[PDB]
Design a protein around this ligand. Structure first.
Ligand SMILES: CCCCCCCCCCC[C@@H](O)NS(=O)(=O)OC[C@H]1O[C@@H](n2cnc3c(N)ncnc32)[C@H](O)[C@@H]1O
Length: 398
C-alpha cells in the first residue's frame, strides 16, 4: 500500500540534499532530508499528545514548513489531519472541531484570538484535549526524537478531512485516504509539465485541497516548493525571478492583478514557464497578455471531493476552446449524467467523475455520501456539456 508519509521519506532517500521548502519572507530553507526529519519530530510530538492511528489533528495556521511537516508526520502515524481555513471565525472553526471530533489542535499565533474565543465559549468542542500554540509546538519539537515511526498504515486509511468551502448550506467533511491523495498527486505529476528539481511557487493557503495536493505532488516529483505565505502582489514578481521559479499556481484574478504592477512591464524570468489556474475560466485577453511575455497558462476544473483533480485545459487550446474546462486528466474519467440517470461520454448533463482521486466518504454524512455516488461515479452537482472533441464546459449548478 502507498503511504503519503513514507513517500516523503523515500524522496529524502533519493534527493536528500535537494531543496524542498523555500520561504524567503521567513528565511526558512530546508532540504528533503531536513523536512523529513522535521516530520519525524512532528510525529513524535503528536504521539506524546496522544494521537493514534485514526485520530484527528486540527491545523489552524499560516502556510509554513511546520504545517506540511505536521500532516506528513500525521501521515506516518496513520493519524488524520484536518487543516482549517484561517479566515474562519470562532463559531465556524468550533463547528469543524466538534463535527470532526478532533482531539488535538495545533494553531499559529495569528489564530490565537480565535482559539481563545472558542475556549471561553459555553460548550467548547469536548473532544479537544490539547490546544497547542506556536510557542508550545516549538518547545515540544525541540526535545522531540527524530526517529522514523514504525506503523503499518496507509492505503484506504483516512489521511485528511477537508471541509467543503465555507458554506452553501451543507458544510461537510471530505475524507481522503493515502490512496486517493496519492492518486491525485500522481495524476497531477503525470499530467502537467513538471520536472525533477523544478521550483514551484505556491501562493495559495495550504488548507485548500489544490494547495495540499501541490505540496504532496511536489515531494513525489522532487520539486522545490517556493512558499509565499500571504500573497503579496508587490513582491510576487521579484520572488519569481530571485528564486528562479519555473511554475506558479494562481487564480485568474491574481494573474490579472499581477500583469498590472510595474514589475510586469519588463519582466525577465528565463526559468518561468507557466501558471496553473482554476475555479473560473481565463479571459482570452488575459491569456494573450501573458502569452506576450511567453508565459503559458494551464487551467483546471476540480472539487474538494476529487482531491483537486479532474479536467485540464492545455495552453495550446486556451483560445481554440476558450471558455472550456479542458479534458480529463491522467487516472481520471469524466462524463455527464442525464435526467434518465444514464451516463454518456458526450452531451449535456450533470458532470460525473470516476477516478481513484475521489473521496472515500463525507465525514459522518451517510445519506449525503450515498446520494453522491451512482455505480462508482461521483456526482459533482455541476451541469455541463462535453463536445464531440471531448472538451468540458461548466454551466449552472444542479
Ligand atoms: C491535474 C491538475 C488539476 C488542477 C485542478 C485545479 C483546480 C482549481 C480549482 C479547485 C476547486 C476545488 O477546490 N473544488 S472547490 O471546493 O474549490 O469548489 C469546486 C467547484 O468550483 C467550481 N469550479 C472549480 N473549477 C472550475 C472551473 N475551472 N471552471 C468553472 N467552475 C469551476 C465548480 O462549481 C466546482 O464544483
Amino acid at each position: 500500500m502507498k503511504n503519503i508519509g513514507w513517500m516523503l521519506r523515500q524522496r529524502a532517500t533519493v534527493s536528500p540534499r535537494l531543496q524542498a521548502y523555500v520561504e524567503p519572507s521567513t528565511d526558512v530553507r530546508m532540504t528533503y532530508a531536513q523536512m523529513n526529519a522535521l516530520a519525524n519530530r512532528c510525529a513524535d510530538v503528536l504521539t506524546a499528545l496522544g494521537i493514534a492511528k485514526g485520530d484527528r489533528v486540527a491545523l489552524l495556521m499560516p502556510n509554513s514548513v511546520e504545517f506540511c511537516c505536521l500532516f506528513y508526520g500525521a501521515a506516518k502515524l496513520g493519524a488524520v489531519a484536518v487543516p482549517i481555513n484561517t479566515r474562519l471565525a470562532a463559531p465556524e472553526v468550533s463547528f469543524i472541531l466538534s463535527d470532526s471530533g478532533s482531539k488535538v489542535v495545533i494553531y499559529g499565533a495569528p489564530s490565537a484570538p480565535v482559539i481563545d474565543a472558542i475556549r471561553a465559549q459555553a460548550d467548547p468542542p469536548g473532544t479537544v484535549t490539547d490546544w497547542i500554540g506556536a510557542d508550545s509546538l516549538a518547545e515540544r519539537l525541540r526535545s522531540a526524537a527524530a526517529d522514523e515511526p514504525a506503523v503499518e498504515c496507509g492505503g484506504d486509511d483516512n489521511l485528511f478531512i477537508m471541509y467543503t468551502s465555507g458554506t452553501t448550506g451543507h458544510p461537510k467533511g471530505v475524507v481522503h485516504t493515502h490512496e486517493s491523495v496519492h492518486s491525485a498527486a500522481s495524476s497531477w505529476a503525470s499530467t502537467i509539465d513538471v520536472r525533477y528539481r523544478d521550483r514551484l511557487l505556491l501562493p495559495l493557503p495550504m488548507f485548500h485541497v489544490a494547495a495540499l495536493t501541490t505540496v504532496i505532488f511536489s515531494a513525489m516529483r522532487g520539486v522545490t516548493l517556493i512558499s509565499m505565505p500571504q500573497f503579496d502582489a508587490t513582491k510576487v514578481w521579484s520572488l519569481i525571478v530571485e528564486e528562479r521559479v519555473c511554475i506558479g499556481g494562481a487564480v485568474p484574478a491574481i494573474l490579472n492583478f499581477m500583469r498590472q504592477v510595474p514589475e510586469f512591464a519588463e519582466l525577465d524570468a528565463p526559468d518561468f514557464r507557466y501558471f496553473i489556474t482554476g475555479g473560473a475560466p481565463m479571459p482570452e485577453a488575459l491569456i494573450k497578455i501573458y502569452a506576450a511575455k511567453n508565459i503559458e497558462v494551464v487551467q483546471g476544473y476540480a472539487l474538494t471531493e476529487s482531491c483537486g483533480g479532474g479536467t485540464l485545459l492545455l495552453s495550446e487550446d486556451a483560445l481554440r476552446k476558450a471558455g472550456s474546462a479542458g479534458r480529463a486528466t491522467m487516472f481520471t474519467d469524466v462524463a455527464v449524467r442525464g435526467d434518465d440517470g444514464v451516463i454518456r461520454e458526450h452531451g449535456e448533463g450533470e458532470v460525473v467523475i470516476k477516478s481513484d482521486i475521489l473521496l472515500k466518504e463525507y465525514w459522518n454524512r451517510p445519506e449525503a455520501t450515498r446520494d453522491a455516488f451512482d455505480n462508482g461515479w461521483f456526482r459533482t452537482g455541476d451541469i455541463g456539456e462535453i463536445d464531440d472533441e471531448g472538451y468540458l464546459y461548466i454551466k449552472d449548478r444542479l
